[PDB]
Enzyme design. Sequence first.
Site, PDB file in Angstrom:
ATOM      1  N   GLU A  83      -2.786   7.446  -6.210  1.00  0.00           N
ATOM      2  CA  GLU A  83      -2.886   6.716  -7.465  1.00  0.00           C
ATOM      3  C   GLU A  83      -4.056   7.261  -8.277  1.00  0.00           C
ATOM      4  OE1 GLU A  83      -3.013   2.513  -6.641  1.00  0.00           O
ATOM      5  OE2 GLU A  83      -1.256   2.631  -5.329  1.00  0.00           O
ATOM      6  N   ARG A 121       0.829  -1.201   0.000  1.00  0.00           N
ATOM      7  CA  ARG A 121       0.000   0.000   0.000  1.00  0.00           C
ATOM      8  C   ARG A 121       0.866   1.255   0.000  1.00  0.00           C
ATOM      9  NH1 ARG A 121      -3.358  -2.334  -2.071  1.00  0.00           N
ATOM     10  NH2 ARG A 121      -5.513  -2.697  -1.377  1.00  0.00           N
ATOM     11  N   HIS A 169       0.184  -0.373 -10.042  1.00  0.00           N
ATOM     12  CA  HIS A 169      -0.636  -1.280  -9.251  1.00  0.00           C
ATOM     13  C   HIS A 169      -1.053  -2.482 -10.093  1.00  0.00           C
ATOM     14  CE1 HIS A 169      -3.458  -1.230  -5.535  1.00  0.00           C
ATOM     15  NE2 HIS A 169      -3.265  -2.476  -5.932  1.00  0.00           N
TER      16      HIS A 169
HETATM   17  N1  LIG Z   1      -0.144  -4.411  -5.589  1.00  0.00           N
HETATM   18  C1  LIG Z   1      -1.069  -5.356  -5.743  1.00  0.00           C
HETATM   19  O1  LIG Z   1      -1.582  -5.585  -6.826  1.00  0.00           O
HETATM   20  C2  LIG Z   1      -1.491  -6.157  -4.547  1.00  0.00           C
HETATM   21  C3  LIG Z   1      -1.241  -5.662  -3.273  1.00  0.00           C
HETATM   22  N2  LIG Z   1      -1.600  -6.342  -2.180  1.00  0.00           N
HETATM   23  C4  LIG Z   1      -1.314  -5.777  -0.865  1.00  0.00           C
HETATM   24  O2  LIG Z   1      -0.303  -6.558  -0.224  1.00  0.00           O
HETATM   25  C5  LIG Z   1      -0.534  -6.596   1.185  1.00  0.00           C
HETATM   26  C6  LIG Z   1      -0.320  -8.003   1.725  1.00  0.00           C
HETATM   27  O3  LIG Z   1      -1.322  -8.879   1.215  1.00  0.00           O
HETATM   28  P1  LIG Z   1      -1.527 -10.318   1.901  1.00  0.00           P
HETATM   29  O4  LIG Z   1      -0.174 -10.906   2.206  1.00  0.00           O
HETATM   30  O5  LIG Z   1      -2.544 -11.099   1.106  1.00  0.00           O
HETATM   31  O6  LIG Z   1      -2.195  -9.866   3.288  1.00  0.00           O
HETATM   32  P2  LIG Z   1      -2.160 -10.801   4.593  1.00  0.00           P
HETATM   33  O7  LIG Z   1      -3.268 -10.353   5.515  1.00  0.00           O
HETATM   34  O8  LIG Z   1      -2.091 -12.241   4.149  1.00  0.00           O
HETATM   35  O9  LIG Z   1      -0.749 -10.409   5.255  1.00  0.00           O
HETATM   36  C7  LIG Z   1      -0.590  -9.210   6.002  1.00  0.00           C
HETATM   37  C8  LIG Z   1       0.503  -9.416   7.039  1.00  0.00           C
HETATM   38  O10 LIG Z   1       1.112  -8.168   7.381  1.00  0.00           O
HETATM   39  C9  LIG Z   1       1.327  -8.120   8.793  1.00  0.00           C
HETATM   40  N3  LIG Z   1       1.342  -6.722   9.289  1.00  0.00           N
HETATM   41  C10 LIG Z   1       0.289  -5.893   9.417  1.00  0.00           C
HETATM   42  N4  LIG Z   1       0.688  -4.687   9.906  1.00  0.00           N
HETATM   43  C11 LIG Z   1       2.021  -4.741  10.096  1.00  0.00           C
HETATM   44  C12 LIG Z   1       3.080  -3.829  10.586  1.00  0.00           C
HETATM   45  N5  LIG Z   1       2.802  -2.566  10.988  1.00  0.00           N
HETATM   46  N6  LIG Z   1       4.345  -4.296  10.619  1.00  0.00           N
HETATM   47  C13 LIG Z   1       4.662  -5.542  10.228  1.00  0.00           C
HETATM   48  N7  LIG Z   1       3.752  -6.419   9.775  1.00  0.00           N
HETATM   49  C14 LIG Z   1       2.442  -6.088   9.690  1.00  0.00           C
HETATM   50  C15 LIG Z   1       0.221  -8.968   9.401  1.00  0.00           C
HETATM   51  O11 LIG Z   1       0.615  -9.565  10.641  1.00  0.00           O
HETATM   52  C16 LIG Z   1      -0.033 -10.015   8.333  1.00  0.00           C
HETATM   53  O12 LIG Z   1       0.660 -11.227   8.640  1.00  0.00           O
HETATM   54  C17 LIG Z   1      -1.954  -6.106   1.415  1.00  0.00           C
HETATM   55  O13 LIG Z   1      -1.921  -4.928   2.218  1.00  0.00           O
HETATM   56  C18 LIG Z   1      -2.524  -5.774   0.052  1.00  0.00           C
HETATM   57  O14 LIG Z   1      -3.157  -4.491   0.055  1.00  0.00           O
HETATM   58  C19 LIG Z   1      -2.213  -7.529  -2.260  1.00  0.00           C
HETATM   59  C20 LIG Z   1      -2.513  -8.122  -3.482  1.00  0.00           C
HETATM   60  C21 LIG Z   1      -2.178  -7.487  -4.750  1.00  0.00           C
HETATM   61  O1  LIG Z   2      -4.478  -4.264  -3.951  1.00  0.00           O
HETATM   62  C1  LIG Z   2      -5.278  -5.229  -3.825  1.00  0.00           C
HETATM   63  O2  LIG Z   2      -6.069  -5.265  -2.846  1.00  0.00           O
HETATM   64  C2  LIG Z   2      -5.292  -6.325  -4.836  1.00  0.00           C
HETATM   65  C3  LIG Z   2      -4.933  -6.019  -6.252  1.00  0.00           C
HETATM   66  C4  LIG Z   2      -6.052  -5.728  -7.192  1.00  0.00           C
HETATM   67  C5  LIG Z   2      -7.159  -6.561  -7.235  1.00  0.00           C
HETATM   68  C6  LIG Z   2      -8.201  -6.287  -8.108  1.00  0.00           C
HETATM   69  C7  LIG Z   2      -8.130  -5.180  -8.940  1.00  0.00           C
HETATM   70  C8  LIG Z   2      -7.023  -4.346  -8.898  1.00  0.00           C
HETATM   71  C9  LIG Z   2      -5.984  -4.620  -8.022  1.00  0.00           C
HETATM   72  N1  LIG Z   2      -5.583  -7.538  -4.456  1.00  0.00           N
HETATM   73  O3  LIG Z   2      -5.794  -8.492  -5.314  1.00  0.00           O
END
Ligand SMILES: NC(=O)C1=CN([C@@H]2O[C@H](COP(=O)(O)OP(=O)(O)OC[C@H]3O[C@@H](n4cnc5c(N)ncnc54)[C@H](O)[C@@H]3O)[C@@H](O)[C@H]2O)C=CC1
Ligand SMILES: O=C(O)/C(Cc1ccccc1)=N/O
EC number: 1.1.1.-
Lengths: 328, 328
Positions: free
Chosen positions: A270, A241, A290
């Site tokens: 963004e 994020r 993204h």
């Molecule tokens: N750029 C993209 O297209 C995508 C981005 N994301 C982002 O990636 C991030 C991670 O996704 P997931 O692994 O599926 O989530 P998740 O919920 O599986 O993992 C999050 C982890 O971060 C830890 N955490 C939370 N706050 C923290 C802090 N201040 N310091 C250290 N650790 C902390 C939690 O304990 C948790 O284990 C999400 O925030 C999501 O928004 C996810 C999917 C696609």
């Molecule tokens: O940032 C996220 O939460 C995402 C990536 C995403 C998902 C759908 C559409 C745009 C970006 N998780 O999958």
Amino acid sequence: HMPLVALLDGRDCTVEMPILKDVATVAFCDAQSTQEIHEKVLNEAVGALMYHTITLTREDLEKFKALRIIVRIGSGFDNIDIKSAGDLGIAVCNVPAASVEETADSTLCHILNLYRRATWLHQALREGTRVQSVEQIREVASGAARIRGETLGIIGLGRVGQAVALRAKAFGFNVLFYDPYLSDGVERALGLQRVSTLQDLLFHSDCVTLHCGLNEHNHHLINDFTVKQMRQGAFLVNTARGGLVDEKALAQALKEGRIRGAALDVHESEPFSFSQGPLKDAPNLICTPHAAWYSEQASIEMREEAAREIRRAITGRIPDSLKNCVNK
Amino acid sequence: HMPLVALLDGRDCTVEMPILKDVATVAFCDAQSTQEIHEKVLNEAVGALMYHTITLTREDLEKFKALRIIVRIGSGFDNIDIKSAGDLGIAVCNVPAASVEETADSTLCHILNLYRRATWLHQALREGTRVQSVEQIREVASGAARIRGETLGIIGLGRVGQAVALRAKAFGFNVLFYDPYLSDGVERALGLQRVSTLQDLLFHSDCVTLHCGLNEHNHHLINDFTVKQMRQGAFLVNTARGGLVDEKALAQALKEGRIRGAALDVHESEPFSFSQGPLKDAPNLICTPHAAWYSEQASIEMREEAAREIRRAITGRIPDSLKNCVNK
Ligand SMILES: NC(=O)C1=CN([C@@H]2O[C@H](COP(=O)(O)OP(=O)(O)OC[C@H]3O[C@@H](n4cnc5c(N)ncnc54)[C@H](O)[C@@H]3O)[C@@H](O)[C@H]2O)C=CC1
Ligand SMILES: O=C(O)/C(Cc1ccccc1)=N/O
Ligand SMILES: NC(=O)C1=CN([C@@H]2O[C@H](COP(=O)(O)OP(=O)(O)OC[C@H]3O[C@@H](n4cnc5c(N)ncnc54)[C@H](O)[C@@H]3O)[C@@H](O)[C@H]2O)C=CC1
Ligand SMILES: O=C(O)/C(Cc1ccccc1)=N/O
Ligand SMILES: [Ca+2]
Ligand SMILES: [Ca+2]
């Protein structure tokens, strides 16, 4: 009885339709904000599907008279005041599984692009650079570094973080992680090293990569203070994020060379532009819009899961039937 | 007696000096060709150090009256007629270990850049593209594909090939390889699938990556014929030798969409330019200036090994003392 289900910040509902055709009236709003939403949807919508491009404060939520569930087509839900949503009787859910490995693969690509300078080397050739001698190769590829023995620091060892760790090990990275909400012992299962503080993480890490959700207590987690805690010439990668990083501090660090390079797929504001913002004239920067999450298979997958969640809500009981409710 | 050792296609000998200071007179020629070399060096040089930017035919070799050993500062020695060199009593050696993992890491970066489109997405942002909606993300990131279940085909399963295979597995790649000179059973040790023909490899592989040395029997191994054997929308990666690919056939394949993307760190004619050659107007192309090998640690390492080989030759017997003689 065919309740209204609305896709807020999108115009395509093709993937969702075969899952909701018989149980919901489906409409889209292609809205970047509430102001763009018709009163009919705000009044009648019983369920809502949304991506990350729209934000729902309590004020925005109050404009929904019949809304009973929100499903984020994605994993991150920092763009929704879920606590208030729940106070208003509105369940909020997400889709955490679809793009885990896509996102982990993108993260590695970025890490490798910083360490191997592949994207910058390609940009240079596009610009006309001619690299004839070995001396020139070293000069233009200056900054490229051997990966084995390097320490990768993971902030947030969840789905993506764990996926990143396992891949990173295959390159000879010594992998550390900081995740204060995880229980004792996960580090042993995956053969990783754990630290108790962010400062420890930043202090021992040559490359820092973010994989934590954006919550109340980690906005600008990376700031002027914590940047000073980062190793000299360190790398920074963010596919989580944008709000996790103060781009002002990152910019200055990049210009000062305190940070050798940064690869960002997410940003404070963004969509991102190289001509707008603090990172405007900041060097050694890679940026993507993204898209770490994206593959055709993943996109379809998450949309199908979201619709199924919507269907479970309409056809069953909230929140007992929900698979991925994040605000019970 | 301080015999002359000459660095042909370079101007810096700093790393080598502390290893040869007491046993050799060291000079450099910064020459792209023989014509650029002084008669004194051609006449007196007993040993030669060279990179890949200069080529030594039998004619060029005959211009050396006192030369007894050549050491390639690198692994590839296709730029030397080693058979003739040996006929002339000139041992030829290389440095096969220094940049194995650097090269494997670059190869993965390129593979990931094709699959995740990170470099092209960054190029687009530089060009001004604004990506506001999800629809736009999918459109601009179109072609990005899920990696798990995909088949990576490795041509040449040596040091770099094996390193690539192990990393590739960590992304969920099904890894195949074709290497007709390897002995029975290597596939079992590393948990890989082996095929007996190039056609089989190209036929089952979504992404093809080259890691074979350039020899008498594989020039333009990738050609109009074998390209037709490649899967539709396949990827191609080359960090080995440019002469392995007919860039005419590759160009047309790219324009026709028969090949979805190509990532090349080596080329038929180096240095490479986006404005010169068949790939001039070819799309979906990534290119780097033969830098897959580079890291500061690797560069120093290979130069130190080469000098040691030079020293083993001067101080000992050829070719019994040599560690990496490729033309006994
Ligand atoms: N750029 C993209 O297209 C995508 C981005 N994301 C982002 O990636 C991030 C991670 O996704 P997931 O692994 O599926 O989530 P998740 O919920 O599986 O993992 C999050 C982890 O971060 C830890 N955490 C939370 N706050 C923290 C802090 N201040 N310091 C250290 N650790 C902390 C939690 O304990 C948790 O284990 C999400 O925030 C999501 O928004 C996810 C999917 C696609
Ligand atoms: O940032 C996220 O939460 C995402 C990536 C995403 C998902 C759908 C559409 C745009 C970006 N998780 O999958
Ligand atoms: N771009 C760069 O900076 C670098 C490029 N390279 C190149 O990468 C290549 C591989 O290097 P290494 O793995 O160290 O060499 P290696 O000698 O360890 O491996 C070569 C392998 O390719 C196989 N092979 C040869 N001809 C073949 C054919 N026609 N079909 C299938 N397989 C074949 C051999 O059996 C051998 O196992 C070299 O040719 C070298 O020039 C190497 C280092 C850095
Ligand atoms: O292509 C090669 O033979 C290389 C890469 C290299 C080595 C030294 C200088 C330039 C390129 N092996 O290491
Ligand atoms: Ca460093
Ligand atoms: Ca395909």
